[PDB]
Amino acid sequence: MIQTERAVQQVLEWGRSLTGFADEHAVEAVRGGQYILQRIHPSLRGTSARTGRDPQDETLIVTFYRELALLFWLDDCNDLGLISPEQLAAVEQALGQGVPCALPGFEGCAVLRASLATLAYDRRDYAQLLDDTRCYSAALRAGHAQAVAAERWSYAEYLHNGIDSIAYANVFCCLSLLWGLDMATLRARPAFRQVLRLISAIGRLQNDLHDNAVILLLQRYPAMPVVEFLNDELAGHTRMLHRVMAEERFPAPWGPLIEAMAAIRVQYYR
Amino acid sequence: QTERAVQQVLEWGRSLTGFADEHAVEAVRGGQYILQRIHPSLRGTSARTGRDPQDETLIVTFYRELALLFWLDDCNDLGLISPEQLAAVEQALGQGVPCALPGFEGCAVLRASLATLAYDRRDYAQLLDDTRCYSAALRAGHAQAVAAERWSYAEYLHNGIDSIAYANVFCCLSLLWGLDMATLRARPAFRQVLRLISAIGRLQNDLHNAVILLLQRYPAMPVVEFLNDELAGHTRMLHRVMAEERFPAPWGPLIEAMAAIRVQYYRTSTSRYRSD
């Protein structure tokens, strides 16, 4: 229910406590975040009586947008070198362990992680979010290494890393943390873990078509019709996802949520 | 001892239509390789489980399962038996009951042995599960080289991970030597490496089908180079994880043993001599 610009202002307010944070980070966060929240709104309405978490709770909504902003900011920090390597390392340790940053200029890290901890419906989801953050950080730095001071790895390594760097796992975990979506339990299902990997691969492939899959393959296998291959790969991952989602029915709002992510395009938020 | 094991696998194989001597030889050869590589490791779990590494009964059973898997693959790919017979066989093996059609008594005998010898019976049910999964992957991959438009490399590899049967191998090992895979598969890192080792096995087998799949869809693509890079890549990822995780013995050695083992030591280069 919170209005778009007020949400941006709330995200920006917190964002100023992070060196390198830009207005763009807050805007993208709210745009991507609203896209998702709007598509799972009908479902969240149905789980609300049970959980006690309101789909329109401003506190939950802005916290979610702040996590998205943090992820956008980190990606830029990593790729555009907005802060020093020492600072990025200190920031990633803090966000990955859930402790305050040891270097100054990044107070927002401790503040957001504390709110998430405090607001967690099922605290297992908070520990998972810290795990996903460490995976995200590792992937951003490994991907960044590849594009330059490297000797390109295999498409396999590329995709495995890109699945972590696309951060869909993080987004899902944060939503589960805030609205009590029981992701920690759902993960016990193999079909669930597999769809997580699939929607993440779908997102990584789509983003790169629109470390990058095309650039990597073309400069490693120039004769190879790279772009054709990838679209095929993307359609393949999509068929597998459709299959698994059919074979198994996940509790609400998971169906709508995965659907929303497959349909989302970097273009609608970036 | 080699030849006595080979003959015990062979003898049982006479109760499976289409079984060839090579199925038994490939089985013992690959199986011997795995068991001798993990031996020093299996000695430490030995007193704890009471399952002796040199146990002849556990050895012959393990090899028969490998032979079953090789035979099943050939039946699917070469049509050694009818589609009707293949369905009845896969049905039986997936439920651990005798095959309903004549000529396949071996199915009953092997599944009864596995049920009788299972350290942790949860591994027996899991083996049946893996057998159904393997059969389903065999079905899919055969029906794919014969339909309309083809599979993506991702779909092929995903199916290929199930069709290489490494899950079945690990499970059978746990079942006979009580390696507690039933609780280990609950570990996300253990699941991740099983997938990596299976992708490695599928690519290795295929580099001696992925190649044909890719060359028929992308003629200008240096396919064999790409697949070789993929194999190297999965191998590096396997090493990265291994280095960052500790798995109860003998799992580390077992995983490494399966990673290395090159098909040229087993199933892809064993056949009956002919004069020509």
Q: Name the residue facing A239 among B155, B218, B232 (closest C-beta).
A: B155
To the nearest 10°, report the CA torsion of A213, A216, A217, A221: 180
Tokens 């979610």 identify what position? A64
Q: Which of A183, A219, A221, A239 best tests the B interface by mutation, with the highest count of B CBs <10 A?
A: A221
Going by C-alpha positions, the residue among B45, B35, B41 that lies closest to residue B1 is B35
In chain A, what residues touch B152 (CB-CB under 8 Å)? 232-233, 235-237, 239
Inter-CA distances, B202 with B118, B128, B205, B219, Å: 28, 21, 5, 22
By C-alpha distance, the chain A residue nearest B240 is A157
Count of CB atoms situated within 10 Å of the CB of A162: 24
In chain B, what residues touch A239 (CB-CB under 8 Å)? 152, 155
Question: Nearest C-alpha of chain B: how many angstroms from A13?
Answer: 38
By C-alpha distance, the chain B residue nearest A153 is B233
Residue B172 three-state SS: helix
Cβ partners under 8 Å of residue B109, min gap 6: B12, B15
Sequence letter at residue B249: A
Does the CB of B185 have a partner CB in chain A at under 8 Å?
A: no
Going by C-alpha positions, the residue among A88, A93, A90, A94 that lies closest to residue A73 is A88
Q: Is A220's CB within 8 Å of B233's CB?
A: no
Q: Is B153's CB within 8 Å of A236's CB?
A: yes
- Measure the CA–CA gap between A247 and B121, rounded to whole angstroms: 28
In chain A, what residues touch B225 (CB-CB under 8 Å)? 221
Count of CB atoms situated within 10 Å of the CB of B122: 15
Decide: B103 and B80 in contact? Cβ < 8 Å: no
> Is the previous residue joined to A190 through a cis bond, with omega within 30 degrees of 0?
no
Going by C-alpha positions, the residue among A148, A164, A264 that lies closest to residue A215 is A148
Q: Which of A157, A198, A231, A243 best tests the B interface by mutation, with the highest count of B CBs <10 A?
A: A157
Tokens 């598969």 identify what position? B185
Using a 10 angstrom Cβ sphere, with 0-12 exposed, 13-18 middle and 19 or more buried, the burial of residue A52 is exposed
- Measure the CA–CA gap between A68 and B221, rounded to whole angstroms: 39
In chain B, what residues touch A157 (CB-CB under 8 Å)? 233, 236-237
Helices A107-119, A124-147: inter-axial angle, 10-degree rounding: 140
Report how far Cα A156 is from the mean position of its chain's Cα atoms: 21
Does the CB of B153 have a partner CB in chain A at under 8 Å?
A: yes
Q: Is B230's CB within 8 Å of A153's CB?
A: no
Cβ partners under 8 Å of residue B31, min gap 6: B59, B62, B63, B66
Does the CB of A228 have a partner CB in chain B at under 8 Å?
A: yes
- E strand or H helix at B33: helix B21-49
E strand segments, chain A: none
Report how far Cα B136 is from the mean position of its chain's Cα atoms: 14
- The method recorded for this entry reads X-ray
Q: Is A232's CB within 8 Å of B153's CB?
A: yes
- Measure the CA–CA gap between A113 and A183, rounded to whole angstroms: 19
Q: Is B229's CB within 8 Å of A155's CB?
A: yes
Query: Largest alpha-carbon pair distance within chain B?
Result: 57
Decide: B233 and A155 in contact? Cβ < 8 Å: yes
Decide: B5 and B54 in contact? Cβ < 8 Å: no
- Measure the CA–CA gap between A53 and A253, rounded to whole angstroms: 13
Q: What is the resolution of this structure in A?
A: 1.9
In chain A, what residues touch B153 (CB-CB under 8 Å)? 229, 232-233, 236
Question: CA B271, B275, B276 angle in degrees (round to 5)?
Answer: 100
